[PDB]
Ligand binder design. Sequence first.
Ligand SMILES: Cc1cc2nc3c(=O)[nH]c(=O)nc-3n(C[C@H](O)[C@H](O)[C@H](O)COP(=O)(O)O)c2cc1C
Ligand SMILES: O=C1c2ccccc2C(=O)c2c1nnn2-c1cc(F)c(-c2cccc(CO)c2)c(F)c1
Ligand SMILES: CCCCCCCCCCCC[N+](C)(C)[O-]
Ligand SMILES: O=C(O)c1cc(=O)[nH]c(=O)[nH]1
Length: 363
Amino acid sequence: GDERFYAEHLMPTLQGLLDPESAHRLAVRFTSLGLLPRARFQDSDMLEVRVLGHKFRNPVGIAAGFDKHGEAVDGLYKMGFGFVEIGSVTPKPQEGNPRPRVFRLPEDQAVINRYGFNSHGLSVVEHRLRARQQKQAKLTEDGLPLGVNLGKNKTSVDAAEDYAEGVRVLGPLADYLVVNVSSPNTAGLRSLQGKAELRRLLTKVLQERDGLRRVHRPAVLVKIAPDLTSQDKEDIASVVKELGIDGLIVTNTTVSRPAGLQGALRSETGGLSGKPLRDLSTQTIREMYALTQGRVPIIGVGGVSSGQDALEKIRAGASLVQLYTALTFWGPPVVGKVKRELEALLKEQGFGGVTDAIGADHR
Ligand SMILES: Cc1cc2nc3c(=O)[nH]c(=O)nc-3n(C[C@H](O)[C@H](O)[C@H](O)COP(=O)(O)O)c2cc1C
Ligand SMILES: O=C1c2ccccc2C(=O)c2c1nnn2-c1cc(F)c(-c2cccc(CO)c2)c(F)c1
Ligand SMILES: CCCCCCCCCCCC[N+](C)(C)[O-]
Ligand SMILES: O=C(O)c1cc(=O)[nH]c(=O)[nH]1
């Protein structure tokens, strides 16, 4: 009902009137103000997942980058997301790259962005989250956890200290933290995915995390690129198991440009998201699940806009999934759509619930 209206009329009209960055800002504002109908979909028990030390009422989250500064968290839960991830947040405020820096590829159901970690900074986000900290504690108890995605400043000399500062400041306010070493839009950042740098970096992050008081001690996940070599992936899996990293987010956007893209803006610099990333992401999930023997929780992300997309990532090894780009095309109704379709497919394929389907392709 609302799905068709948003998909065929409202969203195409917003896109026709507004450049993508302006449209994004409007979306965040409307969401923050709750200017959206409370999702009518009631989450069934078979969508519940217990992972990362928490209950998730459903496995569909909002990916990092939509609410970079923690301004729309409650509105995103109202939209029906089972968990919310904000960020990336950098230690100091920074403006990001010059405009234009976001591009729609409607023929490909894709987006290219080169925002460059535009961030209000840790202090501002800290105070935003503190203003609703007890509300979030209740939401988390009720199965709606909060993740905080940490980045590094453009002019930072010591990347590990940037992430450490993020752990110290926002760790106490998060159910999980994400060490984002896979943005394609910060020079040198992805090199932090290399084995030696990654081990040093994550050792420091986990030390800082372990130093927080117990009820303020988050899970720590690493978010990785879809563009890794086989060697890169082996090394990451090894470091993650060695250090006891709590999970992986798989994947960030791709700097590849798959054959067949039709969008006029396909050769813009930046990370590509949406459908052209979908199966690249799913295969990266599949590989990382195998390399970690299924013992390391994966949040699967990239090109999800249907129950089938979600279930493919879950069967490949994901315990949870996220989406972003689908929102920009389908609007808020896509969340209920994915959940309804996912429940139906689980039933069709003989799964008792999401948990039974995690990694099922490997078995
Ligand atoms: C405009 C835009 C901004 C993003 N910003 C971030 C970010 O700040 N940090 C991050 O870890 N991922 C960021 N992402 C990546 C998404 O979290 C996600 O990994 C990726 O877009 C694939 O999911 P999707 O195909 O559903 O959009 C951003 C993506 C887009 C499209
Ligand atoms: O190109 C982009 C884009 C690019 C890069 C990042 C983001 C976006 C992005 O959010 C977007 C785009 N085009 N349209 N939207 C968009 C616009 C909206 F108004 C809403 C929205 C949210 C809440 C309530 C209501 C009204 O009920 C509407 C929405 F979800 C998405
Ligand atoms: C082998 C992967 C090649 C690159 C990505 C493949 C994209 C598959 C097409 C499904 C997209 C649906 N739509 C509306 C976006 O065109
Ligand atoms: O801020 C950005 O440019 C950004 C960060 C990130 O992690 N991923 C992405 O696609 N963009």
